[PDB]
Amino acid sequence: SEILACEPGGPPPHVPRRSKLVKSPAYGAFPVTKEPAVLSRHDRRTEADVDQVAFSAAGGGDIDEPWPSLIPAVKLYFSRCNFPPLHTLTMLEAINGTPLLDGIDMNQSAGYPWCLTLNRRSLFDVGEDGLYHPCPELYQEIEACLHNPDYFYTTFLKDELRGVDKVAAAKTRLIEAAPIHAIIAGRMLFGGLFEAMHSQPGMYGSAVGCDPDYHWTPFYHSFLDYSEVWALDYSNFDSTIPSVVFKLIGEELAKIIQLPPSIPPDAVQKYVQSIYLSKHVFGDQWYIMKGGNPSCVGTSILNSMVNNISLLSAMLTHPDFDTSAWRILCYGDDVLYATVPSIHPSFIADFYHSQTNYKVTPADKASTFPETSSIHDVTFLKRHFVPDERFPTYIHPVISPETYQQSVMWTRGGPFQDVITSLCYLAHHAGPNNYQKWCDTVQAQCLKSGFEPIFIPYEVLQYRWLATVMT
Numbered sequence: 001s002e003i004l005a006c007e008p009g010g011p012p013p014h015v016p017r018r019s020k021l022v023k024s025p026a027y028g029a030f031p032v033t034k035e036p037a038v039l040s041r042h043d044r045r046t047e048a049d050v051d052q053v054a055f056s057a058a059g060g061g062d063i064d065e066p067w068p069s070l071i072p073a074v075k076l077y078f079s080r081c082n083f084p085p086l087h088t089l090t091m092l093e094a095i096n097g098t099p100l101l102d103g104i105d106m107n108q109s110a111g112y113p114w115c116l117t118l119n120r121r122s123l124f125d126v127g128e129d130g131l132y133h134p135c136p137e138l139y140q141e142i143e144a145c146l147h148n149p150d151y152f153y154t155t156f157l158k159d160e161l162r163g164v165d166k167v168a169a170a171k172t173r174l175i176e177a178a179p180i181h182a183i184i185a186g187r188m189l190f191g192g193l194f195e196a197m198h199s200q201p202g203m204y205g206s207a208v209g210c211d212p213d214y215h216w217t218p219f220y221h222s223f224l225d226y227s228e229v230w231a232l233d234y235s236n237f238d239s240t241i242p243s244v245v246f247k248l249i250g251e252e253l254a255k256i257i258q259l260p261p262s263i264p265p266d267a268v269q270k271y272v273q274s275i276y277l278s279k280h281v282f283g284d285q286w287y288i289m290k291g292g293n294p295s296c297v298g299t300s301i302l303n304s305m306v307n308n309i310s311l312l313s314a315m316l317t318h319p320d321f322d323t324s325a326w327r328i329l330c331y332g333d334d335v336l337y338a339t340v341p342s343i344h345p346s347f348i349a350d351f352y353h354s355q356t357n358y359k360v361t362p363a364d365k366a367s368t369f370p371e372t373s374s375i376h377d378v379t380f381l382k383r384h385f386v387p388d389e390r391f392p393t394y395i396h397p398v399i400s401p402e403t404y405q406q407s408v409m410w411t412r413g414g415p416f417q418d419v420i421t422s423l424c425y426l427a428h429h430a431g432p433n434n435y436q437k438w439c440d441t442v443q444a445q446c447l448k449s450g451f452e453p454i455f456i457p458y459e460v461l462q463y464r465w466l467a468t469v470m471t
Contacts, residue, residue, distance in 0.1 A: 001239045001291035002062040009152050010113050012284040017041075019159050024411040024419065025449035026442045034161040034406040037172035048170035054157060055174075057235075060357060062291030063242030067355045073313035074248045076323060077305070081204050086257050089191030091142060094184050095124070096131045100195040103132070104183065111179030112152040112281060120180055134184070141181035146189070146263055149274035151182040153294045155282035161406060174238075176280065176294035186298050189271055192257060197301055205328040206304035208297065212383060212397035213425075214468055219336075220385045220395040222327060223375050226338035231363040231378045232345050237303075237333035238295040240357040245306050246276040246293070275302065295332075304330040310358065311337060314351040318343050329380070334363070336380050345369045386429070394469045396429040401438070408442055420453045428461040435461075 019036040038050045089098065097103035110120045124132040134142060145151060158175040166172070178186075187194065198209035202218055210219070223229045234240070250272030257268050264270075278289050293299050293306075307330040315321045325340035345360065346369055352358040362369055363379050370377070375385055383397040404423040411419050420442070428435045439455045446453050 001058050001060070001241075001289050003059045004288040004290055006279055006286045006288040008284075008286045009279070009281065011116060012281060012286075013112065013116065013154055015156055015283045016159065020412045021159065021161065021410045022413065024409050024416055025451035026445045026453075027409045028448070029409060029441050029445035030405045032164070032406070032409065033402065034163055035167050036410070037158065037160055037162040038167055038170045039157050039159060039172065043170070045167050046170040050157065050170040050172055053170040054172055058239045058289070058292070060239065063244055063357065066244050066248065067313065069313040069316040070244065070309070071248065072316055073309050074252060076312050076316070077205070077308050078252050083193075083196065083256050086192035086196065088257065088260055088263065089188050089195075091139070091184065091188060092131055092133070094187035094191055095134065098191075098195060100199040101187075101191060104180075104187075106132075109154070109177050111177050111182070112154050114180060115154065115177075123180065138181060138184075142184045142188075145181050145185040146267055149182065149185065149267075149271045151179050151274065151279065153178055153278055153280045155280045155294075161410060174295060178294065178296060182274075183296070183298075186271060189257065189259075189263070189267055190253075190298060190301075193253065194298060194301055197304075198297070202329065204304070205308040205330055206301065207329050207331040207334075207380075208300045208304055210331070212381065213465055216383070216385060216395045216397040217393070217469055219329060219380070220375060220387075221393075222329070223336065223338050225325075226327070226340060226342070226375075228342040228373055229336060229338045229375045229378050230342075230345050230369075230373050231380060232335050232337075232348070232360050232369075233363045234307075234333035234335075235359045235361055237307075237358075239292045240359065241276075241292050241303075241306055241310075242356065243276045243291045245309055246272055246302070249302065249305055249309065272302075275299070300332055303332050307333065307335060310352075310356070311335065311348065314348040315339060315343055317351055318347060331381060334381055336378060388466075391466070391471060394466070394471065396465075398429045399426050401427075401430065401434075404438065416451060417454060421456065424456040424461065428456075428458055429465075432458045432462075 017040045019039055021036040038046050041049055041051055043050065095104055106121045108120060109115045110118055110123060114123065123135050123138045125135060127133045153176040155174055155176045158173040162172065197204050197206055201207050201210035201215055202222060250269045254268040259265060259267060275293055276291060278294060280287055280289060293303060308328050311328055315326065320341050321343065322340055327338050329336040349360045352360055382403055383399045386396045386398045388394045388396060404427045408419065408423055427438050435458055443453055
């Protein structure tokens with residue numbers, strides 16, 4: 001991306017420098033390979049400056065002109081999508097939801113400048129209809145955003161567990177939140193698109209809105225015409241996305257989305273411009289990012305499309321690419337793809353280096369791509385695909401054991417049993433006795449700390465999984 005000067009928008013917010021993650025009653029259970037990310041510039045665990053490292057991948061440059069295969073990739077992706085005319089959501093639908101899209105999370109931040117003196121719930125009144133209505137001040141900001149999407153993302157250091165290597169290097173990610181009036185305006189303009197995609201994960205090359213327990217089965221079987229399936233990940237995807245890709249997507253969506261009379265006719269392109277030419281506030285640092293996208297559900301939908309377009313623009317340069325025999329599945333920077341004939345991720349990586357700012361790598365910190373790869377070797381959202389031993393047509397999402405082995409050793413301050421319960425939903429897919437080994441190890445450590453954990457029985461988790469997957 002490219003970082004530009006920006007006029008301040010008011011009183012600056014505060015960047016939290018202390019982690020909410022504290023050691024849990026199970027902290028000694030497994031060898032500690034993860035710790036809370038560096039948030040303070042004075043953290044003793046690192047010799048680096050976190051504010052410097054966290055922004056080091058930004059400002060590397062933006063691409064304004066399309067590379068020769070980019071426009072063909074745009075046409076190819078939208079040709080396969082075959083979207084019918086889409087419409088906008090009403091303001092009340094964008095707030096409270098539709099049969100195909102849930103309402104907003106009232107517990108999330110209200111964003112700038114609301115998040116200075118007010119939370120999200122305070123800005124709404126429950127009407128006699130039983131739905132949430134915006135207060136007269138929020139309604140007017142949503143309206144003004146539809147005519148001029150001028151708003152600030154609040155930027156913070158993401159408080160989360162990280163590998164001990166990333167802690168020592170102060171490599172902590174950024175979390176950026178849009179304001180509530182920009183979110184509701186965005187759910188109005190693009191809610192028809194969000195409905196179509198979020199309610200059909202696996203279609204349009206996007207996995208956004210998926211439930212891994214349920215969708216791992218159709219995801220798995222969708223890659224069955226292919227002998228080789230590839231996984232790859234982007235480093236600094238949210239900074240390296242060029243403006244030109246978002247701009248081209250906005251022009252396609254402008255022709256698809258039908259606008260109501262109260263909305264200016266270029267609102268689609270103008271809102272997308274507020275995404276790739278965005279305003280940010282990080283503490284008292286006010287700046288504009290040209291290129292990239294702040295790292296939200298709507299942004300994950302557009303990021304999926306960006307990822308699909310970018311990958312297709314790489315495959316279109318391969319001499320043997322069959323424009324009809326391919327499938328892509330994306331969630332953010334996470335990607336599965338397969339082509340016939342198989343295109344090795346080496347080829348995509350080399351094309352990206354010569355024409356874009358994308359730096360692409362294996363999905364398992366493997367530092368190299370395997371010579372071959374199948375649906376059984378691949379990981380997607382940190383999960384393998386493993387058929388059930390008794391009903392092999394149904395596929396378990398088997399997350400890496402490091403996920404729930406490390407997470408259980410930390411808490412954010414709630415009832416610790418809630419941490420144990422939510423990890424049971426991830427861990428039981430490893431098999432009844434691998435699940436038991438995790439439960440037994442966690443219980444022995446908790447006993448020394450004065451806590452008695454209760455684990456959901458394996459029979460409950462396996463039955464309910466088979467029930468939802470339609471067994």
